Design a protein around this ligand. Structure first.
Ligand SMILES: [Cl-]
Length: 310
């Protein structure tokens, strides 16, 4: 019904530091015939669930350094790949991908797996989407680990969440240009540019899911949605602000990648004030946008912060 394609299994043969077994679902209500991949690590019967959401133009591979730390603590860790990324199916038309398409997949996943006691771990798109989830079923959410992310609200309600789109020129402007313009988009080269500490191997794992451009429609659409926010996105992200500010009673841990030209400190400080009870952020000086690349440390420090309240 939704025309999609699937990456050949052989593209993931040679992955570096990703020994996690695949789990798939192809029976989600609203996504017929589409197969979603997700990792499910640690004790399946654990009380605590770490729901790890990735963003553009990545996949669960991004949390590979945090997963073992959260698992080792006794938690179950869920790390789904959005349709159009990783090992999940990829709709071939850019028009199929919208903010609700991705947000409703997550609410479906969460219901399907019956996830409870959720510690939400987000960044980038994982956070644009993920921060609008708790208000849909607040009983399932208990903690939040937030890295460089904000809400896709309208320019007037929160100028900080809109200003980065236009400036600086080597910020989101550069990001979007690198992603939606080339007719020969090489993810490994893009990642090496935006996360300069990746090895060749790690960079290659980020291109793994896309053999050619026909597999990249979701990758092309995400940056356009940051630039052109539809009405549902705006209304939903605007209502989320109220949730975080007045309804949220959980534990929060915030980590900022200080070299991020996109969602760095001028975006993170304002998010921190809207999140009720958000403590002082852990600023990682050498980290850029992809804070997970410096994940072991964020994982360790947040568990340490959350233990100190149990
Ligand atoms: Cl983006």
């Amino acid at each position: 019904m939704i025309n999609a394609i699937r990456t050949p299994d052989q593209r993931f043969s040679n992955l570096d530091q990703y020994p996690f077994s695949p789990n798939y679902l192809d029976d989600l209500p609203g996504y017929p015939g589409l197969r979603a991949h997700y990792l499910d690590e640690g004790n399946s019967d654990a009380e605590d669930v770490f729901l790890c959401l990735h963003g553009e133009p990545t996949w669960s591979y991004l949390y590979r350094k945090m997963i073992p730390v959260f698992a080792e603590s006794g938690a179950r860790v869920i790390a789904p790949d959005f349709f159009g990324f990783g090992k999940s199916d990829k709709p071939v038309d850019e028009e199929d991908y919208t903010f609700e398409f991705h947000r409703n997949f997550l609410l479906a996943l969460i219901e399907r797996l019956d996830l409870r006691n959720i510690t939400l771990v987000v960044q980038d798109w994982g956070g644009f989407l993920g921060l609008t989830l708790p208000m849909a079923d607040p009983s399932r959410f208990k903690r939040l680990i937030i890295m460089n992310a904000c809400l896709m609200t309208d320019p007037v309600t929160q100028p900080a969440f809109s200003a980065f789109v236009t400036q600086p020129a080597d910020g989101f402007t550069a990001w979007k240009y690198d992603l939606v313009t080339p007719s020969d988009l090489r993810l490994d080269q893009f990642m090496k540019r935006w996360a300069p500490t990746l090895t060749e191997a790690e960079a290659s794992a980020y291109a793994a899911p896309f053999p050619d451009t026909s597999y990249q429609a979701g990758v092309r659409k995400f940056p356009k949605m940051v630039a052109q926010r539809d009405q549902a996105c705006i209304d939903i992200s605007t209502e989320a602000i109220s949730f975080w500010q007045n309804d949220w009673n959980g534990q929060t841990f915030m980590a900022i990648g200080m070299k991020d030209k996109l969602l760095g400190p001028d975006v993170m400080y304002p998010m921190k004030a809207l999140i009720n009870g958000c403590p002082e952020p852990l600023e990682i000086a050498d980290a850029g946008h992809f804070v997970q690349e410096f994940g072991e440390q964020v994982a360790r420090e947040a568990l340490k912060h959350f233990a100190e309240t149990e």
